């Protein structure tokens with residue numbers, strides 16, 4: 001027994017048909033087969049859910065940018081495309097990519113080929129494939145940060161579709177201007193029966209993966225990447241002099257779940273083991289292959305790797321992976337405590353240049369903010385990078401540029417961290433309505449008024465305005481803003497209501513739990529005021545809301561809410 005998507009992939013000639021014929025039909029949309037295929041090419045057909053009556057079809061596009069790195073030429077091309085063919089905005093994402101919403105079917109090939117001819121790609125941004133690979137977004141020249149970044153690039157390249165469908169459709173097969181040889185040799189290796197050596201996809205095969213697959217790379221300590229949520233987390237381990245020697249690996253995280261279906265759940269990734277640095281790409285493929293061959297393909301709700309690991313347990317999974325790796329994992333090595341880093345504000349690269357992280361609420365770049373960011377990036381010929389908290393880092397800045405860049409940013413309303421509510425600095429919301437077809441309610445368009453209401457509750461209770469909690473909001477339980485790691489998570493569960501989740505911590509090292517269902521938007525103060533009063537009244541010195549939640553436990557918190 002096999003899902004509808006499996007058959008679509010099977011009969012597509014490696015992601016070509018009938019997408020190829022649908023792209024040139026006169027209709028404003030494309031058929032269901034083509035709807036599923038185009039995801040693999042980094043585009044999503046959407047309809048605007050605000051405009052009553054009619055189906056206004058449009059296409060969202062998502063880029064592929066390992067480590068969040070965006071060359072100058074790409075940023076300029078994307079900025080112009082958003083205005084010419086989109087709806088005037090770029091959307092920075094929780095996986096360090098751009099989305100561009102609103103593109104009409106007839107302009108889609110113009111847009112994607114422009115991306116392609118300007119040092120970018122959308123290949124594999126969606127689909128049953130490896131998604132954008134995360135890495136530390138800060139452009140530090142420190143050796144282990146550079147090594148984390150190189151590794152994410154290499155992993156992304158390894159797991160890039162090889163069929164040629166992408167260039168066939170978007171640029172009529174022409175050639176666009178080299179991967180390290182370690183990548184090529186790893187991809188080619190079949191000493192342990194990992195590959196399909198005669199297939200146009202030696203790793204993916206005809207069927208690709210059972211579902212999206214997510215990888216995050218970082219250096220010890222830096223949890224900007226929210227590593228525990230990914231299919232694979234990879235951590236650089238270095239000797240005492242800061243020279244990288246290998247990687248710790250984690251497996252089997254995921255956020256996605258469905259309301260009222262308790263066999264679906266978020267899950268933290270398990271520590272799997274350590275490998276020496278030369279082995280990383282072999283170990284990554286082994287893991288991918290184990291999911292390829294064993295993840296469920298009958299029911300897509302249960303297809304992500306977190307489920308096979310939940311069913312088999314981590315030891316049986318390890319053993320299976322070790323058959324494709326051809327050797328044993330070493331013991332996972334100790335790591336320091338995780339820390340969240342925003343990379344915001346003025347900092348040093350380590351090579352004489354500065355970087356500046358720009359706070360962007362929800363990653364939505366538009367209006368004057370967009371115009372000013374483009375002027376700066378273009379005038380100073382800056383490369384940039386996207387952070388997993390939907391923010392933008394301006395790289396490679398000369399000391400003499402710091403003042404005029406600062407002045408321009410401030411003039412457009414783009415404030416430095418010290419002038420932003422600390423709630424906003426760590427908050428995230430998904431796009432949800434109006435273009436998300438799975439949204440049950442608002443997230444991006446509701447979060448800002450929610451934050452002000454939280455700050456007003458703090459004020460009322462007597463909490464200082466420099467105190468904060470991590471607030472994440474989604475419009476549905478898919479978890480695109482990783483709400484299940486929040487200190488205070490709001491997960492859409494009706495048209496005007498949120499399920500509230502507590503128990504995440506400031507460094508994203510813990511999984512939250514479901515605290516109350518169907519809290520109506522108007523009622524959130526009834527829940528938040530007692531919680532925050534009790535935190536303020538009985539927290540230990542400097543104890544975060546999340547740690548306090550986990551120490552106190554849900555029975556006592558519910559009692560406090562119920563007696564309010």
Ligand code: SRM
Pocket residue numbers: 044060062092093094095096097098099125131132211212214226229253254255256257304390429430431432435436437438478479480481482
């Ligand atoms: C833009 C972005 C959210 C954001 O505010 O930044 C996003 C937006 C959507 N995600 Fe997501 N997801 C984004 C990262 C995530 C993450 C976070 C992460 O990867 O760290 C998760 C949770 C981790 C996980 O995958 O478990 C997430 C879990 C989902 C799911 C649930 C997946 C599952 O296996 O259960 C879906 C729906 C699906 O795949 O069926 C989904 C599907 C969607 C769709 C494409 C809706 C759809 O299927 O048509 C989104 C479009 C909204 C729009 O109108 O633009 N998205 N999605 C995400 C940043 C993504 C990127 O690749 O560049």
Ligand code: SF4
Pocket residue numbers: 430431432433436437438439440443474475476477478479480481
């Ligand atoms: S979490 Fe739900 S509502 Fe939000 S973007 Fe993802 S799918 Fe859409």
Ligand SMILES: [Mg+2]
Pocket residue numbers: 039126127128212
């Ligand atoms: Mg997909």
Ligand SMILES: [Mg+2]
Pocket residue numbers: 359360361362363389390391425427
């Ligand atoms: Mg942000």
